[PDB]
Give the backbone structure.
Amino acid sequence: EVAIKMVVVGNGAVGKSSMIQRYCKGIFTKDYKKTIGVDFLERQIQVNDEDVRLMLWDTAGQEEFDAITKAYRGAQACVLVFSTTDRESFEAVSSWREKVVAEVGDIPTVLVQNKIDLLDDSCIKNEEAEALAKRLKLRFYRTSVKEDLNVNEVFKYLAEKYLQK
Ligand SMILES: Nc1nc2c(ncn2[C@@H]2O[C@H](COP(=O)(O)OP(=O)(O)O)[C@@H](O)[C@H]2O)c(=O)[nH]1
Ligand SMILES: [Mg+2]
């Protein structure tokens, strides 16, 4: 049995709260802004013959970039999220990465481009997202929380890397 605290980080409106609700509750609602009224949601899964309890902590956006918060404290893995339709959220990734490393150190991390169902309206070229992932040395996923596309894979990857580097 292992419990893993995972923090989901990135600019406002990229889909962090939706991603957590999708993974832990299996829902996607039509609201302009999602809310999680508790510190974290959780999902208990089996990974490589071990029982893992994933505790997914939501965060605030760039308006709280300098904030030192409970969601980051003792985080054991991290999802860095930007949005297909928000170039500023992509440009912010390196700053979010540096913030997490300075607060918790080196923890398993993945880079996620969410809202890939909106590719027609993309503001990020595929080559530049892949180039950033290679520069930060991070596994990169293109996700659609709305379509339940690659969400499960993100958390499974992080749990496996926590268990075996
Ligand atoms: N089309 C699309 N909309 C999404 C996706 N994920 C989230 N959204 C929407 O993006 C908006 C912001 O999502 P939210 O989870 O509140 O973002 P947060 O501010 O990062 O927590 C909401 O209207 C969500 O329904 C996605 O994969 N595709
Ligand atoms: Mg939110």
In short: Residues 12-18, 31-34, 114-115, 117-118, 144-146 surround guanosine-5'-diphosphate (ligand 1) (CB under 6 Å). The chain has one domain: 2-163. The CA atoms of residues 37 and 65 lie 21 Å apart. The chain has five helices and six strands.
